[PDB]
Amino acid sequence: ISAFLKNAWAKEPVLVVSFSVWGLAIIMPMISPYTKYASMINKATPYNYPVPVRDDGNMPDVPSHPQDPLGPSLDWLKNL
Amino acid sequence: PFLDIQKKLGISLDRHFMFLSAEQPYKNAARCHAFEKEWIECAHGIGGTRAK
Amino acid sequence: MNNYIFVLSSLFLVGCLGLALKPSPIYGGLGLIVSGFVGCLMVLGFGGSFLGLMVFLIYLGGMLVVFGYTTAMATEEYPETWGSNWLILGFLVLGVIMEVFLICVLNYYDEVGVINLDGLGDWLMYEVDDVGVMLEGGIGVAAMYSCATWMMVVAGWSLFAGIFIIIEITR
Amino acid sequence: LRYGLLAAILGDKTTKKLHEYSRVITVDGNICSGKNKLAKEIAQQLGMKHYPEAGIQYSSTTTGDGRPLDIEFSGSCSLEKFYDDPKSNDGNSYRLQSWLYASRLLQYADALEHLLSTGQGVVLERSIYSDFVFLEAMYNQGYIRKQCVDHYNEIKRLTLPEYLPPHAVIYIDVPVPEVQSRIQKKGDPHEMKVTSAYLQDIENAYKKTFLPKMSEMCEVLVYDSWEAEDPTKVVEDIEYLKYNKGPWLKQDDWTFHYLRMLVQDKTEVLNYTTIPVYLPEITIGAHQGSRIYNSFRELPGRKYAPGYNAEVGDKWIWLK
Amino acid sequence: KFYVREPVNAKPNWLAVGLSVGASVFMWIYLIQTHNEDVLEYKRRNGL
Amino acid sequence: DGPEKNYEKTLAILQIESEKAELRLKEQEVRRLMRARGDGPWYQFPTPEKEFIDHSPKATPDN
Amino acid sequence: VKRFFESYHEVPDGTQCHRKTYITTALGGICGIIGSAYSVSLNPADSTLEAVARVGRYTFTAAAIGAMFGLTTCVSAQVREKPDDPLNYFIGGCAGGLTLGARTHSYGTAAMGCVYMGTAAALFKIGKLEGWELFPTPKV
Amino acid sequence: MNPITLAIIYFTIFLGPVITMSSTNLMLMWVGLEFSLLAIIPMLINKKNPRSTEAATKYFVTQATASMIILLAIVLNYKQLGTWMFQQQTNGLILNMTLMALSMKLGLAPFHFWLPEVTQGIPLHMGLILLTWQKIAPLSILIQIYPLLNSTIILMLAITSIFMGAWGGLNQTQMRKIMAYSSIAHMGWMLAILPYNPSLTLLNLMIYIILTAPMFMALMLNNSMTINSISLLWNKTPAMLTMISLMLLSLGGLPPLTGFLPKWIIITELMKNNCLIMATLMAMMALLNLFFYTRLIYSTSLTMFPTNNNSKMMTHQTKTKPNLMFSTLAIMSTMTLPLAPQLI
Amino acid sequence: MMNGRPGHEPLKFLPDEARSLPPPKLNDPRLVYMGLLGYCTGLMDNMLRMRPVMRAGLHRQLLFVTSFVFAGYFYLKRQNYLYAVKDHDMFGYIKLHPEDFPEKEKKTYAEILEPFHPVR
Amino acid sequence: MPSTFFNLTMAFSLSLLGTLMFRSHLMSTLLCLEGMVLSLFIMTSVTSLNSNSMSSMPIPITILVFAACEAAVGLALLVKVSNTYGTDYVQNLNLLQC
Ligand SMILES: Nc1ncnc2c1ncn2[C@@H]1O[C@H](COP(=O)(O)OP(=O)(O)OP(=O)(O)O)[C@@H](O)[C@H]1O
Numbered sequence A: 001i002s003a004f005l006k007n008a009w010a011k012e013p014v015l016v017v018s019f020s021v022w023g024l025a026i027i028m029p030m031i032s033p034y035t036k037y038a039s040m041i042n043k044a045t046p047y048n049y050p051v052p053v054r055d056d057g058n059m060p061d062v063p064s065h066p067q068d069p070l071g072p073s074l075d076w077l078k079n080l
Numbered sequence B: 001p002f003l004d005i006q007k008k009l010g011i012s013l014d015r016h017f018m019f020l021s022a023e024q025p026y027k028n029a030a031r032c033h034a035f036e037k038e039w040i041e042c043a044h045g046i047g048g049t050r051a052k
Numbered sequence C: 001m002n003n004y005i006f007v008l009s010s011l012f013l014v015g016c017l018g019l020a021l022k023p024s025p026i027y028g029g030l031g032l033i034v035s036g037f038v039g040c041l042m043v044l045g046f047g048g049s050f051l052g053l054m055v056f057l058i059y060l061g062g063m064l065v066v067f068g069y070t071t072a073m074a075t076e077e078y079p080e081t082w083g084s085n086w087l088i089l090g091f092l093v094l095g096v097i098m099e100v101f102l103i104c105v106l107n108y109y110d111e112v113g114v115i116n117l118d119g120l121g122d123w124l125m126y127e128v129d130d131v132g133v134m135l136e137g138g139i140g141v142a143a144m145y146s147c148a149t150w151m152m153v154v155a156g157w158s159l160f161a162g163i164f165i166i167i168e169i170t171r
Numbered sequence D: 001l002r003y004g005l006l007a008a009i010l011g012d013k014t015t016k017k018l019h020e021y022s023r024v025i026t027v028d029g030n031i032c033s034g035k036n037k038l039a040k041e042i043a044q045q046l047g048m049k050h051y052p053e054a055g056i057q058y059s060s061t062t063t064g065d066g067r068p069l070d071i072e073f074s075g076s077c078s079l080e081k082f083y084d085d086p087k088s089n090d091g092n093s094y095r096l097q098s099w100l101y102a103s104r105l106l107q108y109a110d111a112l113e114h115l116l117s118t119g120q121g122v123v124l125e126r127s128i129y130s131d132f133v134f135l136e137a138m139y140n141q142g143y144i145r146k147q148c149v150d151h152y153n154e155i156k157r158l159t160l161p162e163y164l165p166p167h168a169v170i171y172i173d174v175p176v177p178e179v180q181s182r183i184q185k186k187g188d189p190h191e192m193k194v195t196s197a198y199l200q201d202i203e204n205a206y207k208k209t210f211l212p213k214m215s216e217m218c219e220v221l222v223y224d225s226w227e228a229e230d231p232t233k234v235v236e237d238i239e240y241l242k243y244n245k246g247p248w249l250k251q252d253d254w255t256f257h258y259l260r261m262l263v264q265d266k267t268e269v270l271n272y273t274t275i276p277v278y279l280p281e282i283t284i285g286a287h288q289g290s291r292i293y294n295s296f297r298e299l300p301g302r303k304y305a306p307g308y309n310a311e312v313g314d315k316w317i318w319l320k
Numbered sequence E: 001k002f003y004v005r006e007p008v009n010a011k012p013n014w015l016a017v018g019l020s021v022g023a024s025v026f027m028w029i030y031l032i033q034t035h036n037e038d039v040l041e042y043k044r045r046n047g048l
Numbered sequence F: 001d002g003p004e005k006n007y008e009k010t011l012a013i014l015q016i017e018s019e020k021a022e023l024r025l026k027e028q029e030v031r032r033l034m035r036a037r038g039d040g041p042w043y044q045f046p047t048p049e050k051e052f053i054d055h056s057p058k059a060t061p062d063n
Numbered sequence G: 001v002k003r004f005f006e007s008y009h010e011v012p013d014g015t016q017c018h019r020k021t022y023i024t025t026a027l028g029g030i031c032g033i034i035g036s037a038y039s040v041s042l043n044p045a046d047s048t049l050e051a052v053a054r055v056g057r058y059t060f061t062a063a064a065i066g067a068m069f070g071l072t073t074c075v076s077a078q079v080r081e082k083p084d085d086p087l088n089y090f091i092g093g094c095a096g097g098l099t100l101g102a103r104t105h106s107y108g109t110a111a112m113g114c115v116y117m118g119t120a121a122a123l124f125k126i127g128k129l130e131g132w133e134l135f136p137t138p139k140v
Numbered sequence H: 001m002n003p004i005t006l007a008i009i010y011f012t013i014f015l016g017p018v019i020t021m022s023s024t025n026l027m028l029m030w031v032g033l034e035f036s037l038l039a040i041i042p043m044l045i046n047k048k049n050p051r052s053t054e055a056a057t058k059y060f061v062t063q064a065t066a067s068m069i070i071l072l073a074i075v076l077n078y079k080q081l082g083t084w085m086f087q088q089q090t091n092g093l094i095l096n097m098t099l100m101a102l103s104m105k106l107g108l109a110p111f112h113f114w115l116p117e118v119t120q121g122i123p124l125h126m127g128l129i130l131l132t133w134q135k136i137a138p139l140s141i142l143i144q145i146y147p148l149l150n151s152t153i154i155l156m157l158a159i160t161s162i163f164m165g166a167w168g169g170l171n172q173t174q175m176r177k178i179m180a181y182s183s184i185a186h187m188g189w190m191l192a193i194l195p196y197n198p199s200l201t202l203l204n205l206m207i208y209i210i211l212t213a214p215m216f217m218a219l220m221l222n223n224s225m226t227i228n229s230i231s232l233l234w235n236k237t238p239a240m241l242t243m244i245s246l247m248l249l250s251l252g253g254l255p256p257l258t259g260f261l262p263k264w265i266i267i268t269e270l271m272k273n274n275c276l277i278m279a280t281l282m283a284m285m286a287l288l289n290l291f292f293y294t295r296l297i298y299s300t301s302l303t304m305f306p307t308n309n310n311s312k313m314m315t316h317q318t319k320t321k322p323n324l325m326f327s328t329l330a331i332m333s334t335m336t337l338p339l340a341p342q343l344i
Numbered sequence I: 001m002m003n004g005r006p007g008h009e010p011l012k013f014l015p016d017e018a019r020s021l022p023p024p025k026l027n028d029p030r031l032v033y034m035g036l037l038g039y040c041t042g043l044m045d046n047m048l049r050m051r052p053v054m055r056a057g058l059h060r061q062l063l064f065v066t067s068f069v070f071a072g073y074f075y076l077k078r079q080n081y082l083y084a085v086k087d088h089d090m091f092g093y094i095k096l097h098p099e100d101f102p103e104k105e106k107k108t109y110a111e112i113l114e115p116f117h118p119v120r
Numbered sequence J: 001m002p003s004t005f006f007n008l009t010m011a012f013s014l015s016l017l018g019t020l021m022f023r024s025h026l027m028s029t030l031l032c033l034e035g036m037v038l039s040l041f042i043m044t045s046v047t048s049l050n051s052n053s054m055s056s057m058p059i060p061i062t063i064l065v066f067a068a069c070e071a072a073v074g075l076a077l078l079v080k081v082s083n084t085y086g087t088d089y090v091q092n093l094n095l096l097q098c
Helices: A002-011 A014-031 A037-044 B005-009 B033-042 C002-020 C025-045 C050-070 C086-109 C141-145 C149-169 D005-009 D035-046 D079-084 D092-118 D132-141 D146-162 D176-185 D196-215 D232-239 D253-264 D266-274 D286-297 E014-046 F003-036 G002-009 G017-041 G048-078 G086-103 G107-130 H003-022 H026-044 H050-081 H092-106 H114-120 H128-133 H137-143 H153-169 H175-192 H199-220 H227-231 H238-251 H260-271 H276-289 H291-302 H311-316 H325-332 I016-020 I031-048 I060-096 J002-020 J027-050 J058-085
Strands: D025-029 D168-172 D219-223
Touching (some): A002 A014, B005 H003, C025 C050, C025 J027, C050 J027, C141 C149, C149 J058, D025 D035, D079 D092, D092 H311, D146 D266, D168 D196, D168 D232, D176 D196, E014 I016, G048 G086, H003 H128, H026 H137, H026 J058, H050 H092, H050 H114, H050 J002, H092 H153, H114 H128, H114 H175, H128 H199, H153 H276, H175 H260, H199 H325, H238 H325, H276 H291, H325 I031, I016 I060, J002 J027
16 A cells, blocks of 8 residues: 555645544544643633632631632642 | 433433523523522422413 | 614614515625624624624625526526516515504504613613623534534534535536 | 345446446347348357347246247237238237337346346347337338327337447348348248338338437447348457447446346336326227236246246245 | 246245244243243232 | 023123223313313423523622 | 404394394405405416406405395394294305305305305304304313 | 435434434424425435426425424524423414424425425325325424414314315325325324324324325335326236225225224314314315225226236236335234224 | 323333233233234235245244234233323322212112103 | 514514515525524524523524525525526426426
């Protein structure tokens, strides 16, 4: 098939680049290491106010003050 | 509906945006969200000729 | 200023009425673009920007094919305009006078409800959310790719199948 | 695996089987132009399958025991009666011609399936495309009422368009004064009483309509009596033909499949030849028709589908 | 008589025979247990 | 067999068919109320589903 | 106006003869106009003049059926003062067929109309007297 | 057509009803109708002859406009209640426009004229789909809104379907036109009982499908398109005669066969709703629908017409057309009345 | 009409509650009929294709006899359950509303003065 | 909002009144279907924007995807109509009379 692949490359290159990049865009997301970071960045953007939640003495893992170390953090975004 | 295939398989193909209070794209309450949320709760189980 | 959407809607009705009288398709397209162009505006007046430019970007491309097709199949030695036939012109002025008679007469019988001549412009927006982002119209259309994907496959298939449908008819 | 949409999908396309000699070649001429000798030699040289001219008993030699049936079943037409009394009160003349057209239409179907199945060429002789000459010749002399020519042109109109004209038609010209001398020499006392005018209308029906009309859709090759003898040269002429100007060029791979399916189903081929147009010459009647059909079924090898007739000796009926 | 055209049904379609007869026996078999299992179930639920 | 058999078979037929007559009328009269007032299992016309209401707090307070 | 056509059953037959004639005449006239519209559309005339003439022919013909039906049913109650009698509508309905054949030039439609229109007319009063309800509300 | 196109076109027909049945949005219900419209067109023009083109155009413009009237009903409901479902407390005008446009798709009178016209210009197949498969998707729309339809127009449409289906088909020589006027006649019955116990609507739809399909197959054995052509059925293939006669009688309301079960049980259910007058008129005219079937049985099976000489050529050859579903469907119809309680 | 009944599983053939009913006896007057029809279907298949009847498809006719009876048993079981549910709800609804279905006491023939219509 | 929808609905009605009363052309009828969908598209757009139903915004797009496909099929049909009569006229589609 080597001749056919390069014969088309020699005569109709446009239909080989289209097929090549078509397969490249399909496969690249699976191999990239940053593919999972596309979702997290779109979870960071706070378009709506973060509604607070009452305390009943049984809500330990959520922070009290905004700038406290016991909540979700974006320190991985600053260093991406 | 005529065939409860969506319920049978459990997949909500097109039954999560039936009405206004139906989980808008971002958390933006449609106008009159509370009122129709109230109406839909009232008419549940109680069906059709008893909710009119 | 208050009577801004009403004038657009009336021009939409007049433009559509002119399209209902069915002149030669060349002018029907011109009338349709006038109505479609007005259709974009009133949609914009309601706070929606993305949908407005879509009705005016899809029907525009459609009329080129209609213009192409009409000059190929539907033509006469002397195409009919809105004034070629006095009867058509008669029902054009009558139609224009007809809406004013309907618009006015509905007002006196029913003070308000279906039509509000006395109160106009007040009843157009219904409590925008003053503070807020992601509210711009068109984000909803983008839901077609997320939690509305069924509309995406069915609509996409019609374009997919349609290509096969057209080829077979024109074979 | 009866041929169908499934067979084509699985790799039974017709275009891959066609060869250089996979060409339908009809041989046409007058009553005694000498087509059988020219036709058979064409077949042997070019490796094609000869198809003897469809007579009255063609469907009898194609289906069933392979022998002629009683004349009451294979039509109700006799060739000898036509020459003795062509103006008979019973419309034996038109029944003969319409029956022969349906027979040729059936033979032409079989030939196409052969070409579209194995790729082997078929060399007919006087196919349906040249079979209207006799009826046009019959009408001129008055052997047929005008109301039956219209029926014939109606049957032809419905069935002919959906078949592909032959690749090349070989017309062996023989002048009327020569064929009339040839008929007498063949020694059939019923055919030696055919008038010269009837022979002329067949010649005129060829050079006025058939020969020009076919050239617009085939490659015609006119030959004389002295050229036909020793036909090795007619084969050479065919061997070096450039094939254009015909509907065969625009046949795609799938257009063959739909033609192949139509040809395969013989009832679907003859359906339009049995249209209920009530010509007195063609209608059989409910009382004669029930006798012929009931008597036909009471035959060895009939009364059941070909695989199931037990009187022949077909076995394993209780598994088929 | 000896047919000029070889019949499409010259021999049994043995593939059809096996699947046709086989599915008949399987269908009969699956029917017997269902009756004997539903009857047995009927006795368990409603009592004797 | 004698008059006993037919006499006491006819009695069985009569009750098997008087009970059917009574039940059919109660079938008609039960359905008449159920459709007028949807108080029963039958004629429960569909109503919009409740599980797809979104209950999480939204952007604006006054949803 | 719906309430107008409801007045036909406000009084026993014979009483207010003039009002009941008008109700039937208008009711038949509407049927002609509704029917005449189809003839104008399906199987049209050669010109507008013939189209309106056809509309007039049916509307006035149909209006005649109502008037003679109303006159005969109402007059037949004033004499033989038995208002609740289906026979009155049969004679009244019968007169419609006799009127019908007067317009369409043939006795066959005249003799057939009495048997059919009269039988349909008589059944109508039986329905309103016995409480028959066409187009019933689904109740099971 | 080629397999790739055939697969896509047919697969589009199948998604039409499936989407309409499964989906809950009335919009997706409408989108299901559009596929049925679009996918049918290429098949009706498969022959590519002037009659087919005229058939497709009338079918397209009649159902394209109908597809827009229904859309107005759906959009106006979204204004009124904000939901994409035809709930209770909806304007009867909005719903009446629905049954109005749905009647156009089905082919009920007085919107029936387009159906007999179209079926004449298309082959025996694609009449089977147009009259059986295409008529399921609109019905699924109505079955889910059956407790809302107005009791008046729903019946006034059924009556004229019964009459205009019987009177019109009383003088049709062409078989394809007869099968269209039977669809109108029988679709008066399915719509007549729609507000009252819709379960019988499907029963009369399924029975109707089981009958026409063998009939359309019975006409596909020899492409018999007229009463004269089917009058030659005894000479070509007399085997069908025993069951063309029974199926045709069954399609008419004769008691012993299983076409009387629909008319019988429908009349019973209307009779339970104090509907004396409209079952008589509807039932009385049903017998008329059995007349031109009785005319057809005379021509085909009982009294046998003159044949043609060439017809003796057809008996020589063997046939393998009937797809074995003709037999099973022919006996499921014309019998199974003893199995009526299992049907209801 | 029973589609919306409480506890109705969607698009399910035989609910688990349906197994608490007597199964068809497998020789019921109507399962034999399905087999008899299936035989008639098989015989007519041979009739339509000029095959011998009662002799040709002894494996097709066996298939039809089983296919109809096999299908009939399962379809018959479903219908037996549907009629069971109809009666279960019909009587259950009657208990809840005595004021709508009172236990009316009829009067013996000694008391009622039924009229008389002589023949003369 | 109330005043404009009466104008949009009657815009559909006039276009509906146009696709029913035919004229001497078949391109014109297809153009009338365009106006009907144009009215339907805007009503869904205004209602969605009026009620702030961003989940219902995809619906008006899909009407255009299918309505325009009706035009695509409608225009392809009209090619076959003209290739068999050469005039596009509507009174030439009377060959199914019998
Ligand atoms: N369509 C027809 N109508 C009437 N007679 C016909 C028809 N076709 C053939 N015949 C007659 O049937 C006989 C056929 O002879 P034909 O010419 O085919 O002989 P051959 O053995 O094939 O070869 P050749 O005659 O060329 O030596 C002639 O009598 C011809 O007149």
